[PDB]
Amino acid sequence: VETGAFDPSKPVAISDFTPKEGGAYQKLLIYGENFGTDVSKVKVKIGGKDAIVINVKSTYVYCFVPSGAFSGEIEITVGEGENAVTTTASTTFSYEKKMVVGTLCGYRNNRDDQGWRDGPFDGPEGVKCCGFSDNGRLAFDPLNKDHLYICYDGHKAIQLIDLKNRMLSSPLNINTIPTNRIRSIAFNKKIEGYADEAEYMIVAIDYDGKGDESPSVYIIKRNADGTFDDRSDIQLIAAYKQCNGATIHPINGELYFNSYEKGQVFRLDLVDYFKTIKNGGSWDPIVKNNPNTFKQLFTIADPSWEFQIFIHPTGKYAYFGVINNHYFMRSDYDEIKKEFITPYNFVGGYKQSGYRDDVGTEARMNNPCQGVFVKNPDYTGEEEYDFYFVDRLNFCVRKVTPEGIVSTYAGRGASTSLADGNQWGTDDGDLREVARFRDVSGLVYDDVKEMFYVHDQVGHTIRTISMEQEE
Amino acid sequence: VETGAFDPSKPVAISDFTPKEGGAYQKLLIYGENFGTDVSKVKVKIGGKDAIVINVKSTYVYCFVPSGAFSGEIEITVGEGENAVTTTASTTFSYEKKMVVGTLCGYRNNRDDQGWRDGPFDGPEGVKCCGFSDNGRLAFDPLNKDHLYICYDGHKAIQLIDLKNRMLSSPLNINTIPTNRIRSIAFNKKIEGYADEAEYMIVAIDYDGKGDESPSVYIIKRNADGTFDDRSDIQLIAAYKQCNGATIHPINGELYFNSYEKGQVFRLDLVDYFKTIKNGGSWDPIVKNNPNTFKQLFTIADPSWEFQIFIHPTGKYAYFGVINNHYFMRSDYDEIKKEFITPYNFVGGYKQSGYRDDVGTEARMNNPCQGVFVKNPDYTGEEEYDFYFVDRLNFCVRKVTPEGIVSTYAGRGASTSLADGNQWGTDDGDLREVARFRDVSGLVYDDVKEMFYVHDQVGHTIRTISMEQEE
Ligand SMILES: [Cl-]
Numbered sequence: 001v002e003t004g005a006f007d008p009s010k011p012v013a014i015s016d017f018t019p020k021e022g023g024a025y026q027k028l029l030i031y032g033e034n035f036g037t038d039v040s041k042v043k044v045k046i047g048g049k050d051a052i053v054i055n056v057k058s059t060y061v062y063c064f065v066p067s068g069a070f071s072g073e074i075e076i077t078v079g080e081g082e083n084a085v086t087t088t089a090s091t092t093f094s095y096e097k098k099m100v101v102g103t104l105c106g107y108r109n110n111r112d113d114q115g116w117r118d119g120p121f122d123g124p125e126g127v128k129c130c131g132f133s134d135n136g137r138l139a140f141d142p143l144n145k146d147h148l149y150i151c152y153d154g155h156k157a158i159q160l161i162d163l164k165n166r167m168l169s170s171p172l173n174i175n176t177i178p179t180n181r182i183r184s185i186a187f188n189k190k191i192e193g194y195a196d197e198a199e200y201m202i203v204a205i206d207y208d209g210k211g212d213e214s215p216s217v218y219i220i221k222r223n224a225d226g227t228f229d230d231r232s233d234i235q236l237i238a239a240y241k242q243c244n245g246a247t248i249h250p251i252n253g254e255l256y257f258n259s260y261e262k263g264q265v266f267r268l269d270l271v272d273y274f275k276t277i278k279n280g281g282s283w284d285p286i287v288k289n290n291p292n293t294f295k296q297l298f299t300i301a302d303p304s305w306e307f308q309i310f311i312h313p314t315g316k317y318a319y320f321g322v323i324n325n326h327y328f329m330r331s332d333y334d335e336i337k338k339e340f341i342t343p344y345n346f347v348g349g350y351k352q353s354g355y356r357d358d359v360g361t362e363a364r365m366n367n368p369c370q371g372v373f374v375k376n377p378d379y380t381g382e383e384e385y386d387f388y389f390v391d392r393l394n395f396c397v398r399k400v401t402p403e404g405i406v407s408t409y410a411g412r413g414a415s416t417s418l419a420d421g422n423q424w425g426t427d428d429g430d431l432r433e434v435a436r437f438r439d440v441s442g443l444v445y446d447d448v449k450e451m452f453y454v455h456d457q458v459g460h461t462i463r464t465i466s467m468e469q470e471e
Numbered sequence: 472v473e474t475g476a477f478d479p480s481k482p483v484a485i486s487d488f489t490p491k492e493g494g495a496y497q498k499l500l501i502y503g504e505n506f507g508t509d510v511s512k513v514k515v516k517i518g519g520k521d522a523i524v525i526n527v528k529s530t531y532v533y534c535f536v537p538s539g540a541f542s543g544e545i546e547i548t549v550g551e552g553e554n555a556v557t558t559t560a561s562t563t564f565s566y567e568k569k570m571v572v573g574t575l576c577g578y579r580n581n582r583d584d585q586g587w588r589d590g591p592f593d594g595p596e597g598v599k600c601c602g603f604s605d606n607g608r609l610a611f612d613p614l615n616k617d618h619l620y621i622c623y624d625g626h627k628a629i630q631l632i633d634l635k636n637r638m639l640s641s642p643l644n645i646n647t648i649p650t651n652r653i654r655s656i657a658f659n660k661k662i663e664g665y666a667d668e669a670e671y672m673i674v675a676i677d678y679d680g681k682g683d684e685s686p687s688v689y690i691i692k693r694n695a696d697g698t699f700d701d702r703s704d705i706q707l708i709a710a711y712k713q714c715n716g717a718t719i720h721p722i723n724g725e726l727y728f729n730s731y732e733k734g735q736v737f738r739l740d741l742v743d744y745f746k747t748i749k750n751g752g753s754w755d756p757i758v759k760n761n762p763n764t765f766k767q768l769f770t771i772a773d774p775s776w777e778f779q780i781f782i783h784p785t786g787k788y789a790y791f792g793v794i795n796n797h798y799f800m801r802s803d804y805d806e807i808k809k810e811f812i813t814p815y816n817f818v819g820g821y822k823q824s825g826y827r828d829d830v831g832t833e834a835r836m837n838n839p840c841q842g843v844f845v846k847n848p849d850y851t852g853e854e855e856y857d858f859y860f861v862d863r864l865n866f867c868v869r870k871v872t873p874e875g876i877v878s879t880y881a882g883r884g885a886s887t888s889l890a891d892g893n894q895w896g897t898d899d900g901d902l903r904e905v906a907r908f909r910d911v912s913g914l915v916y917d918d919v920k921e922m923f924y925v926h927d928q929v930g931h932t933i934r935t936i937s938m939e940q941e942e
């Protein structure tokens with residue numbers, strides 16, 4: 001062989017590589033000897049995973065770090081058959097793990113005829129659980145994050161996704177609720193003299209069968225054994241019409257709920273409710289007849305405005321997600337009055353659906369659904385959180401900084417959307433290169449395990465976003 | 472007056488505001504009393520600067536924090552004439568200063584007939600200095616950052632911008648150089664036994680008047696009094712043809728220079744040069760006849776490739792800015808051989824001019840010129856720098872992260888480009904809302920004062936990017 005050509009009678013050596021650490025898709029430069037000058041004659045594995053070889057030039061090889069290369073062991077084989085020579089680098093590459101999309105439970109077969117079935121997360125079709133097909137919202141039991149509840153707009157049971165025993169059940173059949181349009185789940189904060197922390201599940205429903213005296217919000221009391229099920233006491237706490245959600249202030253504990261009719265936002269101090277029942281009184285849930293107790297703070301925009309309220313963990317502000325008109329508004333909280341004030345347009349285009357990462361009202365989204373605040377360790381001032389939400393008709397999770405910069409966090413996998421031409425899909429893995437979702441409606445974040453659970457309504461699955469693990 | 476209306480017989484009060492700190496363009500919420508409900512009747516000043524009032528609702532006012540509101544004093548006046556009532560908040564807003572574009576020296580009058588004139592940075596037209604009209608490059612004297620040199624492609628003097636005495640001079644008339652196409656300025660690193668740190672200015676020129684034996688690089692020796700001027704010894708160190716720049720490796724000290732002909736990159740160890748002259752030898756600068764001394768490492772792409780070399784402060788890699796074909800390539804440095812290796816496309820589109828912030832080869836630029844590496848305090852690993860370059864025909868400074876994300880750092884002011892419809896201009900101030908440049912060719916960064924100097928070739932000015940200051 002000539003100068004620079006591969007010599008199969010001599011060893012192949014790796015002397016160094018750079019960078020020494022990195023994540024999947026990182027370009028890696030490997031230095032050594034006897035690599036030859038042809039990509040076709042070189043194969044590289046990193047952490048036991050086959051790696052894409054970019055260029056080979058005698059004393060160096062460029063390749064891409066593969067997903068899941070945990071061990072960082074670098075192995076190279078030059079030549080083929082009788083002439084193949086292999087070596088392994090003496091030091092390991094330091095693989096930096098990334099968040100990845102996974103699938104927890106649920107499935108959709110080729111005929112989409114699996115239906116609904118309670119049971120184990122895993123097993124053969126016919127045994128493993130499935131359903132999850134109506135638009136939904138997620139909420140953890142604040143006293144036990146192994147218990148993840150899901151409510152649905154179109155399925156009249158609130159289900160329990162039990163992460164510890166890996167079982168799906170339907171403990172809440174809410175038979176007295178007059179509709180299957182269940183919109184949200186919240187829990188009370190402790191109320192001195194009246195209610196322990198999360199003793200009550202607060203459930204919003206979307207109904208207008210009794211005109212403007214139609215139920216909006218119910219309250220369900222935890223059983224003596226700690227469960228929420230059909231033995232639980234359930235009471236009507238507010239009735240107007242067309243409610244799309246109810247949310248609890250994380251510091252002061254009052255309840256905010258709306259009506260789509262004119263986009264009203266109502267404020268209820270639960271102390272009024274518990275004080276009345278404690279003194280053997282009759283509670284009147286008819287909002288219109290009691291303007292001092294169910295205080296109407298404002299209308300956020302125009303009539304027929306469908307939205308939910310997401311309050312910052314400090315309680316100092318909230319985002320109002322306008323599901324049917326494709327934007328979020330922001331509202332500041334007056335800490336002395338203990339009320340939110342008239343909101344203003346924050347991110348997205350007023351009545352203009354689309355998909356565009358940009359700043360403020362130049363960003364575009366399409367049917368924004370559930371959102372959550374997540375601590376960003378890089379923030380050091382008084383603002384410590386970013387906001388993440390499922391953008392339903394764009395099949396992804398978006399991120400919103402406090403300044404209003406909107407980006408795409410997970411979904412619409414670049415490589416997978418090329419293979420089949422669809423921005424939607426079921427692929428697990430790398431957040432923006434591979435992973436895909438179908439219509440996404442629900443989202444929660446476990447702030448201790450540092451992971452998201454996502455309700456993929458049209459995939460009929462519960463997905464996860466969490467740190468990859470060596471199996 | 473009714474409930475919520477302004478009452479001119481009562482004081483106006485400010486009780487609180489949020490956020491407590493922030494920068495220009497921040498939305499500020501001011502709480503208080505007696506503000507009325509009309510924006511037309513309210514005026515706000517912050518730090519003595521008039522502020523844009525957004526919304527007024529009796530007990531709160533929303534406004535934008537103005538540029539230059541250093542003192543943070545909040546003053547509000549409600550009403551007019553005899554009914555005007557003013558109050559000042561008892562606590563000050565904490566104004567966070569930002570980088571701003573400024574103009575150091577040079578000017579362009581309405582007839583663009585000021586020409587060239589050495590002298591003071593300030594004064595009346597006819598006295599204050601001007602010129603700066605040919606495409607240029609900037610370089611500090613490594614031993615004195617008060618001395619900023621500028622060389623020009625089309626003006627046969629190298630000028631001194633003396634930041635201490637605020638005077639422009641022309642100390643280097645380089646009479647023996649055969650052209651006015653001066654392309655770059657560099658300085659040697661200390662060479663044990665031969666040359667002290669920055670004892671020599673290394674100057675690249677663009678010439679082909681003697682075919683392939685045409686001068687490319689000269690070396691100019693510092694005078695006994697520390698100056699570089701017409702008393703300085705000047706020698707030809709390399710001659711091929713069509714050189715576009717020469718750069719010194721910041722750790723090992725060797726010299727890299729190119730030729731546009733085939734896009735060659737040549738490597739010269741200056742020790743060879745000084746050893747020859749020290750021993751009473753004759754130095755032969757003809758590159759073609761001495762392939763072992765002027766080592767040709769590679770050709771970077773196709774023929775007729777105009778580019779400069781920008782080496783990372785660690786010396787571990789370099790970016791090659793292809794001026795005439797609108798992209799940057801990246802080259803890794805082999806620390807054992809002490810040579811760069813064949814480069815690869817990094818950011819921008821190969822032969823595709825444009826303006827687009829994006830990742831890698833999806834980004835678009837137009838005539839990328841001088842670039843500099845700048846430490847980012849947020850980076851904690853082995854990579855501590857970002858890269859900034861002047862994108863000439865896009866009238867701005869762009870930023871390139873090590874991963875290849877290209878953004879716009881300064882220029883193309885949003886508000887000013889609306890007023891007149893031009894992306895170019897002369898405005899000073901806010902980096903992306905107001906400031907504008909015309910064609911930009913030169914760029915340096917003082918890593919101690921934390922400021923950039925920019926050569927705005929068509930504005931005929933030297934601009935600054937630095938922290939705003941209370942005058
Ligand atoms: Cl072979």
Ligand SMILES: [Cl-]
Nearest residue numbers: 323367369392
């Ligand atoms: Cl929706």
Ligand SMILES: [Cl-]
Nearest residue numbers: 550551554555
């Ligand atoms: Cl008035």
Ligand SMILES: [Cl-]
Nearest residue numbers: 794838840863
């Ligand atoms: Cl140019």
Ligand SMILES: [Zn+2]
Nearest residue numbers: 015016031807
């Ligand atoms: Zn090495």
Ligand SMILES: [Zn+2]
Nearest residue numbers: 037038039040
């Ligand atoms: Zn080949």
Ligand SMILES: [Zn+2]
Nearest residue numbers: 116154155156
């Ligand atoms: Zn159902």
Ligand SMILES: [Zn+2]
Nearest residue numbers: 146147162164
């Ligand atoms: Zn359980």
Ligand SMILES: [Zn+2]
Nearest residue numbers: 194195196199
């Ligand atoms: Zn109790």
Ligand SMILES: [Zn+2]
Nearest residue numbers: 212213286289
């Ligand atoms: Zn009635």
Ligand SMILES: [Zn+2]
Nearest residue numbers: 334336337502
């Ligand atoms: Zn207040």
Ligand SMILES: [Zn+2]
Nearest residue numbers: 358359362363
């Ligand atoms: Zn825009």
Ligand SMILES: [Zn+2]
Nearest residue numbers: 336486487502
């Ligand atoms: Zn206050």
Ligand SMILES: [Zn+2]
Nearest residue numbers: 508509510511
């Ligand atoms: Zn008015």
Ligand SMILES: [Zn+2]
Nearest residue numbers: 587625626627
């Ligand atoms: Zn001139």
Ligand SMILES: [Zn+2]
Nearest residue numbers: 617618633635
């Ligand atoms: Zn001086």
Ligand SMILES: [Zn+2]
Nearest residue numbers: 665666667670
């Ligand atoms: Zn000396």
